[PDB]
Amino acid sequence: AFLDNPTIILAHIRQSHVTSDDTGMCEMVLIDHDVSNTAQRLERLRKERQNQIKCKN
């Protein structure tokens, strides 16, 4: 086969990612017009540190 010039390779990439993607995103992303877990960890560590420091070492 002859997929060597960048235009045919670009067109193949765009049509392959647009048509054969089950999830939506690509046909919104590849539009050719232009061609909190750490908060949970911090609040848990806060409530653990509140009860934790009560003794002398």
Binding site: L10, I13, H17, D21, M25
Partner: peptide, 17 residues
């Protein structure tokens, strides 16, 4: 993550130029 293929496509488009 549901943006995997949409990012690999941009990486492949970037690697040509």
């Amino acid at each position: 993550d549901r943006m995997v293929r949409a990012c690999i496509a941009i990486i492949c488009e970037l690697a040509l130029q």
